[PDB]
Subunit: 333 residues, 4 copies
Amino acid sequence: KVKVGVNGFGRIGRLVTRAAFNSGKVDIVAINDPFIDLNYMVYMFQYDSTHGKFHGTVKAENGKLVINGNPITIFQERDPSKIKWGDAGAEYVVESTGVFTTMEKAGAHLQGGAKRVIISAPSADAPMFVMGVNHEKYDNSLKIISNASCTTNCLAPLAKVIHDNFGIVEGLMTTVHAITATQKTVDGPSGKLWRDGRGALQNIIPASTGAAKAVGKVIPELNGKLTGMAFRVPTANVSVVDLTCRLEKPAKYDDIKKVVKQASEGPLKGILGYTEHQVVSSDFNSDTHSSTFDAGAGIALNDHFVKLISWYDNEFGYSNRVVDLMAHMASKE
Amino acid sequence: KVKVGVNGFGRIGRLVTRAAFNSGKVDIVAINDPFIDLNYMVYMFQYDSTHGKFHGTVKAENGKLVINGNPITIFQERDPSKIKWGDAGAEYVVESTGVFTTMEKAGAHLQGGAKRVIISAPSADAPMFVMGVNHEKYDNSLKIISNASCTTNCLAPLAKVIHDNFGIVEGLMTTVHAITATQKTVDGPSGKLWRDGRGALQNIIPASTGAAKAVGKVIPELNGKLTGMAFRVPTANVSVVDLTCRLEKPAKYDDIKKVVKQASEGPLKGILGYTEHQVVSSDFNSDTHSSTFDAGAGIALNDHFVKLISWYDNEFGYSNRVVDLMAHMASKE
Amino acid sequence: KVKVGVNGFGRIGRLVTRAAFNSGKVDIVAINDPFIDLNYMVYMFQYDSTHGKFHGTVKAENGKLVINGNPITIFQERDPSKIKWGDAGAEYVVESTGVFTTMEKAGAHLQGGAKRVIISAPSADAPMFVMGVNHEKYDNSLKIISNASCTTNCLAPLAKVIHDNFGIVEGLMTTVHAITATQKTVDGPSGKLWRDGRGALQNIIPASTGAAKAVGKVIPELNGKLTGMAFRVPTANVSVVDLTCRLEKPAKYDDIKKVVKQASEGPLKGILGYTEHQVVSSDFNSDTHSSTFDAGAGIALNDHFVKLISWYDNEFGYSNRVVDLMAHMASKE
Amino acid sequence: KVKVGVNGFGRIGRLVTRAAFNSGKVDIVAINDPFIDLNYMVYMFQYDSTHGKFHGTVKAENGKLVINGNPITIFQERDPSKIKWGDAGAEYVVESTGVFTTMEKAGAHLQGGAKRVIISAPSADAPMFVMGVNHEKYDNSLKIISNASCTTNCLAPLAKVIHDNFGIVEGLMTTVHAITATQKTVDGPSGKLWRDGRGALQNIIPASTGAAKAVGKVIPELNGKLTGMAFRVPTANVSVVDLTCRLEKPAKYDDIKKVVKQASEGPLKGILGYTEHQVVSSDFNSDTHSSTFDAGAGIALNDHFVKLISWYDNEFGYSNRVVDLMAHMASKE
Ligand SMILES: NC(=O)c1ccc[n+]([C@@H]2O[C@H](COP(=O)([O-])OP(=O)(O)OC[C@H]3O[C@@H](n4cnc5c(N)ncnc54)[C@H](O)[C@@H]3O)[C@@H](O)[C@H]2O)c1
Ligand SMILES: NC(=O)c1ccc[n+]([C@@H]2O[C@H](COP(=O)([O-])OP(=O)(O)OC[C@H]3O[C@@H](n4cnc5c(N)ncnc54)[C@H](O)[C@@H]3O)[C@@H](O)[C@H]2O)c1
Ligand SMILES: NC(=O)c1ccc[n+]([C@@H]2O[C@H](COP(=O)([O-])OP(=O)(O)OC[C@H]3O[C@@H](n4cnc5c(N)ncnc54)[C@H](O)[C@@H]3O)[C@@H](O)[C@H]2O)c1
């Protein structure tokens, strides 16, 4: 029902658009990207190495990007404050360029007529939300919000179930993550982050990530009780969270499995999945869950110290959550 | 000094051979592999996708494999008990086929004339040793021993320094490991381990490993205090250990760095390395250390709960340790 | 309509099965494979790293593999002559193990009750067929036939159109091919073909192939006028043919494009595809065509000397052709 | 003996520097690059995912980059005309940024005191040279020249031998090429060349290249007789040329092997290599040849139509040729 504008037609921008058209929860009416012109957008949206060809029609007609017969107004503005979102009917704007993540920068979309902005990435100051964890805390006074990161969306739902049932005293996370657009094909310049400049296809690359610490923001009781790091590995998509945590209350591995499965079939259905199958990363290709607990992969040392594994299609799950968040925001109008 | 025979001229078999001829600490005099004839061995030893062309000379001459002018007797037996090690003068036999890891199966080499057998992998019952951690425990009454696994050789040295200084109350390990010969190029049969049959190039594959629990064998005080699992990723070589542990005594990260660096420059020099550089996996290709602590990659939640990272060339480091172990055994004869 | 048995539940065996159910052209009633028991077959068929999770249902029940509610009888015989195909009612058998490609070896299935056998690979003596090129040459006297190779199925349709219209004087083909089950994850034993044993993830590997010369089997006028070779590269699926040929009747590139496009919309529809889009290999993942002409990738030096490019999903296209061939055979009974 | 400056410390810039320091042919005295500060240069030079760690010494000292005890002046100018090469003592300047390939743009280095400029890439108007093919045509009146491309440096030597001996009527080339810095890790923007923006790890990507046509420049008699294209594949380094050509005079494949072997042992030694071994791409990692003929990989259809295969480390071979060219230029001062 709510009309949406998308700033940045990258992996997230394009997949959020796909999710929107596939679920029908929101209607994309405008897209802005100064580097990708209309004809090129058709091509980028139609063919996707990771998620396959688009199911439907996508064409350029009279200057509009038409997807399944729905005309989308296209903008090519480098400065957010200059995008005429209002004229195009875009009430909500998905900020997915990665360069306007602060309240001040993301707020520029409001100058163009947009009513609310959803940053598809962590924000230093904008309120962060995670579907299934604290999205109910959202309220109409918030005009600029964040949907956190893919990794936080994977860890948070799992951590909530674990903390709620056994209490997390402290935890350390490692995410074995697929390569992303910020990486390089061969050893190249990355002045601010040297390891990230090394060839992505040749290396296992350690990288910092505030995704675990961020959980404390969506689950206040866990603030200061979690942190971790990441390892970028040579796969194009799908990542996995490895959470090592200490529990305050005794928890046999089978008890953990029971509560997680119960959560996946109830309140967290569609967000937190559960499996006992002998899965591998590709099995989650295009899987829309934010997190899928892998029962057989985890291992416990004792009743108070365990390692829990959860899979996440870092592109598809997150993109669907952005749409879900906007759908929820719309119901609160 | 001690004359050695190699059973299974594979990644470890060939690299152990390369390591032996480089240091000259032991003399390879015989090799057995029914799946690689003499002329084929020349080619397999001469060219290596991972470690480059052999630096010396290798040729087939008078029915022997000649490396740097040293003739090696070649056997082609599937049955270990049928190998005439004695006639070839092989005193120690490196059992690197991966299919004769028990005392009973590995002991077959003794029937052929060998005096001792070193299993290049963990064993269900053969005494396990890790250079720099418990190799001094070895004695002449042991005719069949194990050099553990690559992963245990990476974790044990680090765990030793951490435990000796701060005391490890409990720890959970994850190793992001390069693919190996047991994996498949595309989804194929692996009846005993379903996940391992899935395409190695396309997937992050969780796998069980007793490497962490095994540390309890080489470091008795840590028995039952460590365990973990592995993730196989799409890289041809070099792996990394991710140890999440709770310490008894307060250990600020800088103090952890200090003690590990001190150990690397002293009693564990050559076994445990230390670096503060912004390294990635490829920086350790052909690195002979058993474990190299990555100061910048690790992260601490507090003074008693930290995640430690250590790199290891799973093929090269381990192969050099097999040679070091035999050299130590020889010194006690 | 015709009831089919599948010997060898591998990439081709499983995808032929998937194709049979998805297309519904033939009915799979039996499967034989000594290295994959019933429960494992459910897993291998349900999850696929390359083509995604099966969209229907698959379960084990009372010793049967039930796909979309259809019970499949399961055999576990290593000896083809011992498989009781008749017990299951299987009339045609798809021989896809890769080890019974001769008439004598493939014919073993007739002893168990099967009526005809289709070898999913080239055969030294079994008549070979390529859908769209010479499948009409099949007749009821042939009880054992071959569906050629994936590469021949890609080149033959294209060669047919080019020869029919311009006449091929001579041609040399190179196929840049995805890795297959015959390759190794790391440098390993491959006594008959040394290059094939080298690490598949690390290398571009030259390989011989009789696929181009084999076009003559199905297009006799091209006997002695074609041959080529292959390069195996680090991709899990989808390959490409690169045909460099000299024409008898000079033709502008646009005219070549015209006749190929015409063919793709006519008699060769579904077999020979045509595209002018800026495609890459992934765009053909799960594409059922035997060959798809890439108009923009090819290049002509002049009107009589050109390089033509055609894509093929080596797993999916071929598997669908096997089903198409059996449907055609059934119509001739 | 000649003092050299390097503009652009990328793959080629850094590798040309490595080659310069291990031949004494030339001495690097200055380097310019605005996107890589001094401390970062130390890191990028000392570690290399493809060619391993630098085995000599490298450190930042007193504002200069010191390699093997030799101080190098470091500049950070974005405008070539502003670099003070003259005062730094740089007589020749290697232009390896890839953005100043024309006579006009490359000449900017002359304004700063440089005497001659060697463009490490094809130039639209600067005279191009290929060592072993037409470098004897260079003379000291030329202040700005081009060393062509890696691909042209691979094809030219081979084409010369084939043409000189049998005469090339016409030919079409395909190069299966490793990924480069211009590619993307995941589907991203490449507005000018859409296929090049597609994920480099996931795809075989067809791409245009004028390397074959350029051979007609270094070998005038082949002007307009050669052209071709490329396929980018998921490997980090080492590429291969696939030349399909028509010969004027008859030539059995063994005759071709004979003349290529002869050329490699004489006039083209070190430039054109020859092998009959069962090699794969990795065997050419860090190989300094411009082209290595693979006897066993090629195939002939008849005495006048053949497919010839030649390997080339696109980074290492070329970088060494740049140094060899400057050494030649110096001998002609
Ligand atoms: N590769 C690593 O990173 C690594 C590290 C530490 C330990 N290991 C262990 O070392 C052992 C070998 O590993 P690898 O990676 O070298 O494997 P590999 O497959 O490369 O080598 C095995 C070799 O054994 C030969 N072989 C098989 N059966 C034989 C028989 N009956 N008699 C004689 N030879 C036979 C094979 O032809 C092959 O060359 C395994 O137990 C493995 O778990 C591997
Ligand atoms: N994969 C491709 O791209 C492709 C394309 C065209 C043709 N082919 C051809 O198809 C055949 C199979 O190839 P694949 O890629 O599916 O191989 P694969 O290894 O994936 O499958 C082979 C299957 O045969 C089974 N098997 C082995 N021995 C058996 C026996 N004695 N009885 C019954 N089953 C047995 C194995 O367990 C395995 O599941 C080969 O001849 C191959 O050349 C492959
Ligand atoms: N890599 C190969 O395989 C290969 C082989 C032969 C030729 N080439 C050619 O060599 C050139 C460089 O290629 P590469 O692969 O080394 O690329 P690269 O991206 O690795 O290196 C380019 C370098 O130029 C620097 N740079 C950019 N603008 C600059 C400026 N204005 N002044 C100074 N430095 C600047 C960058 O920071 C970077 O470090 C290209 O023209 C390319 O076509 C590449």
